[PDB]
Amino acid sequence: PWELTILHTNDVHSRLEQTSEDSSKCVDASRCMGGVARLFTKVQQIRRAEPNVLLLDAGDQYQGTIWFTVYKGAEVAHFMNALRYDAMALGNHEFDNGVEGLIEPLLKEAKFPILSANISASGPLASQISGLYLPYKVLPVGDEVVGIVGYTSKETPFLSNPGTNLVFEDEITALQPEVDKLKTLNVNKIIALGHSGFEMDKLIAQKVRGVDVVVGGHSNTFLYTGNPPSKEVPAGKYPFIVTSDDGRKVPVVQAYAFGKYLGYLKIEFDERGNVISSHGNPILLDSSIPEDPSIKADINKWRIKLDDYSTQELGKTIVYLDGSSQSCRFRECNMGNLICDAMINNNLRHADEMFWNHVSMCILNGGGIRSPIDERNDGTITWENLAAVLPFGGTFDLVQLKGSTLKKAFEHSVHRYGQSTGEFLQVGGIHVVYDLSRKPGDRVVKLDVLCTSCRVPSYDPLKMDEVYKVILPNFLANGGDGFQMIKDELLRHDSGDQDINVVSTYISKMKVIYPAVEGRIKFS
């Protein structure tokens, strides 16, 4: 039997440096995790021990920290090249800077193939991008070859900025003919590597005949066999076994996010390319693994431009930006309005005749706003100033919520009002009126929301049965601050852009800001 070791990462999201246990800024070095210098140490160790190794990335290296803000993907090409990745699938966030922000920095500079079989181009873009990404690549491994076939979320137009010259095809429709073609070319060992989420990965393992292994991403899915080594709770065993329509056992793997773990799957194949066995587990990249000194010194050299950028003026405010707890945990605060307005601006996607924009609504825990910004430094706002307001390393995610769920969230917002607790919600595209003299759970007396399916945006009463798109912190999507109803009742969840980066881009665009308190939240 021919044994292959698959090493894999996904949704690394700009975590070039080691991180805290929750993937935020490293504070206590002796307990920090991940980063590319530590990953290098572990990959090097495995390649010294195992003859047949592939190192794969399932997309979403782009977006997550100031590294991406400043280097715009040049850091991805440089450090993935240094780690000698064998292949990468395109994720949704590889489109955050448009097709031009993908072609240059990443597609032209990567020394490995970049894959997606379900993205097609038209017009002059088709000629410009031809061959810079591939449906698949056949790679030599020892005396054998392995086909790797890519895929990317069909939902990418709603979750990034790919433009109107790319079409994202149904994954299974696009994959099947490519996998059948590889069989005609005597390629009997096939990996599907791609970026659609665990649920789609299981459908691909079930329905795409000839796929031996699925290596996925997007949903930040943690899988594990045995007692978990850290705080992430597994969604299933590692690998997750799907029984295919043709009766094979197909392993499905993912490795959480943020470079905290290295996926590690051993596959035994027979002479005909059938999987005999599969086993493994993600490896926690904790402090017991030393950071490679050479990669660490290069990271520290690249950090100088980040430190310089962090104190540059992004733009100006002519108003005090009130991010005080006394304001933002008790009433509408103009820092809350700014952040929610930045969140909606970040989520303007391709227009369509059925909506002015796909999403119009924002909620934000007031306890997540951690500092004001004074306007008396000649109005200057810097990244360092925003990092004081938003220090947690979160994202502003897209969810679908029934109106009933959102009403329950606004009741929870004020269920114990008056104690300076963090659950009080700041908003955008929502007008709420509370009556605090009513019983907890029955304090919301008006709730109006900005339409999407309209050419002129206007407010209408919230409907209990209707599903709304809402932008909100990942902290709330995951049920933080007691918002268990959001976690338990949401219909869709996709991870969005870095919190600081969303606000910095908005301020840079606007140049001069003056957010008001305007009656989004009232008390009767």
Ligand X SMILES: O=c1[nH]cnc2c1ncn2[C@@H]1O[C@H](COP(=O)(O)O)[C@@H](O)[C@H]1O
In the complex, which residues of this chain contact ligand X (CB under 6 A)? 365, 367-368, 392, 394, 421-422, 473, 475, 481
Which of ligand X, a copy of itself, Zn ion, none does 367 bind, CB closer than 5 to 8 A by kind? ligand X
Residue 61 buriedness (CB in 10 A; 0-12 / 13-18 / 19+): buried
Structure tokens at 480: 């933080």
Which of Ca ion, Zn ion, a copy of itself, none does 273 bind, CB closer than 5 to 8 A by kind? Ca ion
Q: How far is the CB of 248 from Ca ion (least distance, A)?
A: 8
Q: Is 163 in the site for a copy of itself (CB under 8 A)?
A: no
Which of Ca ion, ligand X, Zn ion, none does 475 bind, CB closer than 5 to 8 A by kind? ligand X
Q: How far is the CB of 358 from Zn ion (least distance, A)?
A: 17
Give me the phi and psi of 522, to 5 degrees please.
-130, 160
Structure tokens at 453: 């399916």
Which of ligand X, Ca ion, a copy of itself, none does 456 bind, CB closer than 5 to 8 A by kind? a copy of itself
Q: Are 521 and 331 in contact (CB under 8 A)?
A: yes
**Annotated binding-site residue? 365:** yes
Residues in contact with Zn ion by the rule CB under 5 A: 11, 60, 91-92, 218, 495
Rounded distance, CA 183 to CA 204, Å?
Answer: 17
Query: DSSP state, 424?
Result: P
Q: Are 182 and 227 in contact (CB under 8 A)?
A: no
Residues 254-293 that bind Ca ion (CB under 5 A): 273
**Annotated binding-site residue? 92:** yes
Rounded distance, CA 485 to CA 479, Å?
Answer: 7
Q: In what order do the strands lie in the sheet with 459-461?
A: 459-461, 444-450, 430-434, 521-523
Among 29, 49, 304, 318, binds a copy of itself (CB under 8 A): 318
**Annotated binding-site residue? 478:** no
Q: Is 341 in the site for a copy of itself (CB under 8 A)?
A: no
Rounded distance, CA 304 to CA 78, Å?
Answer: 16
Which of ligand X, a copy of itself, Zn ion, none does 18 bind, CB closer than 5 to 8 A by kind? none
Q: Is 450 in the site for a copy of itself (CB under 8 A)?
A: yes
Which of ligand X, Zn ion, a copy of itself, none does 60 bind, CB closer than 5 to 8 A by kind? Zn ion
Which residue, 5 or 413, has its beta carbon nearer to ligand X?
413
**Annotated binding-site residue? 60:** yes
| Diameter over CA atoms, the chain | 76
**Annotated binding-site residue? 218:** yes
**Annotated binding-site residue? 13:** yes
**Annotated binding-site residue? 329:** yes
**Annotated binding-site residue? 195:** yes
Sequence-distant (≥ 6) Cβ neighbours of residue 138 within 8 angstroms: 145, 146, 147, 148, 182, 185, 187
Which residue, 139 or 339, has its beta carbon nearer to ligand X?
339
Q: Are 313 and 386 in contact (CB under 8 A)?
A: no
Which residue, 249 or 415, has its beta carbon nearer to Ca ion?
249
Site string for Ca ion, 132-171 (x = CB under 5 A): ----------------------------------------
Strand boundaries in 119-245, DSSP class E: 119-121, 136-141, 144-152, 166-168, 190-195, 213-215, 240-243
Q: Is 212 in the site for Ca ion (CB under 5 A)?
A: yes
Task: Cis check for the bond before 461: say yes or no (omega within 30 of 0).
Answer: no
Which residue, 379 or 403, has its beta carbon nearer to a copy of itself?
379
Structure tokens at 255: 């490795």
Residue 501 buriedness (CB in 10 A; 0-12 / 13-18 / 19+): buried
Residues 353-412 that bind a copy of itself (CB under 8 A): 353, 356-357, 375-376, 379
Residues that bind a copy of itself (CB under 8 A): 318-320, 322, 334, 348, 351, 353, 356-357, 375-376, 379, 431, 450, 455-459, 509, 511-512, 514-519
